[PDB]
Design a protein around this ligand. Structure first.
Ligand SMILES: Cc1ccc(C(=O)Nc2ccc3nc(CN4CCCCC4)[nH]c3c2)cc1I
Length: 138
């Protein structure tokens, strides 16, 4: 009976371009998954999959190593599913967030969403990956 908590930070920045691109993109944005300061989520994260709006080319964007992010331009916000896959042999194998990639049509957005994962009775192997990433026993 051991519990290990880890923290993920999901976020995005978005800025209204001074002048739109020749292709009518009004906004640059960047979305990411990371750990807090001094933690290393690559120890227990296999890959992060960002599911972009179906209008984007290759909207299944995968990062297998850090940084777990996508940098894009576009013209609108949307709801972006983000799957974080674990280096876990048992359940849960992954967690899915629905991320609100919203834009400020009149300027800049800099948003952070903090997600605390609780793993009950991880395998010895996966427990090792969580604590090495900076996870805490509860
Ligand atoms: C409700 C909605 C929200 C966002 C988009 C959008 O911005 N789509 C989009 C579609 C294609 C794109 N292509 C780029 C520019 N490239 C993409 C490939 C890598 C280099 C940058 N940005 C793109 C943005 C479309 C809709 I309707």
């Amino acid at each position: 009976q051991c519990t290990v908590q880890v923290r993920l930070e999901l976020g995005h920045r978005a800025q209204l371009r001074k002048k739109p691109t020749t292709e009518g993109f009004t906004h640059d944005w960047m979305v990411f998954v990371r750990g807090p300061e001094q933690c290393d989520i690559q120890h227990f994260v296999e890959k992060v999959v960002f599911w972009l709006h179906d209008s984007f080319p290759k909207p299944r964007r995968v990062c297998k190593e850090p940084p777990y992010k996508v940098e894009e331009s576009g013209y609108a916000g949307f709801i972006m599913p983000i799957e974080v896959h674990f280096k876990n042999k048992e359940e849960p194998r992954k967690v899915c967030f629905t991320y609100d990639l919203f834009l400020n049509l009149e300027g800049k957005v800099n948003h952070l969403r903090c997600e605390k994962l609780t793993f009950n009775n991880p395998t010895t192997e996966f427990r090792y990956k969580l604590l090495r990433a900076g996870g805490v026993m509860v």
